[PDB]
Amino acid sequence: FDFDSLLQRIDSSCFFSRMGLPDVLDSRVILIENVEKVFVNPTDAEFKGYYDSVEWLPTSMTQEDPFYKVKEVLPKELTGLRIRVNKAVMNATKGLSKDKFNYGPHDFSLAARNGICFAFREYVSEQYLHLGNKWEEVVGIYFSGHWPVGIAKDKIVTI
């Protein structure tokens, strides 16, 4: 695990730039067009039956990791890395367009910015402690310019 390689990848990234473009990702991805069709007026055709099963990925620091329920005290090094990945992702997410994050009275821009920082903090925990690859999958979608919003069995719902 190379932490500086992650910071330069974050450095040269284009987060949220490909939201609503019909790109080829993992077969596990369910692609929905926009925030309206995920969160305000969903249809189970676009969710491919999985709407009943979906849980939103965390969009706030006070929410629980859905993949690993790690109760352990973290190494001080890891605490240090999580603060540095958070600041890296905060700098790579300045001045996002609000239009792709807004529908009607709903603004999803804070949820998205919290959600991407959450995913990268947990990805660093995952790779540092060798816990698995659940966050590696989510972060790959972020690096491709999309927003993974939801887990429904082995599927990742994304814009």
Binding site: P58, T62, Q63, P105, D107, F108, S109, A111, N114
Partner: protein
């Protein structure tokens, strides 16, 4: 009608006698809480604890600010729910007698005056 107007209208139908939302209270709600932020489960649990801790102070302030006695045996109801981003503030309380879509993710900001 705005979202806020409909919530205020609905809440008043179930208000204790002598406990209706007043013109003043409705304007304060409109001014102080026009946009709300969805709370996490944990943030909702802490907001509920804050209420249990402050509710006697908040009921006194309801009495002093509307010039009315707290209706006998009424429970304090949040007009804008805590989970939706409602406030623990006298102007968000009203005394009371006692579908499809997943809830919005925490951090979602909603403008109520649309």
């Amino acid at each position: 009608c705005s979202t806020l107007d409909r919530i205020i209208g609905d809440a008043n139908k179930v208000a204790s006698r002598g406990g209706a939302i007043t013109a003043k209270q409705a304007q304060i709600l409109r001014d102080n809480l026009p946009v709300v932020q969805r709370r996490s489960v944990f943030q909702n649990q802490m907001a509920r604890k804050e209420f249990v801790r402050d509710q006697h102070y908040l009921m006194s302030q309801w009495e002093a600010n509307t010039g009315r006695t707290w209706p006998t045996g009424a429970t304090p109801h949040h007009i804008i729910p805590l989970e939706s981003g409602g406030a623990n503030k006298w102007w968000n309380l009203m005394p009371t007698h006692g579908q499809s879509r997943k809830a919005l993710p925490p951090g979602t900001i909603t403008d109520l005056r649309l």
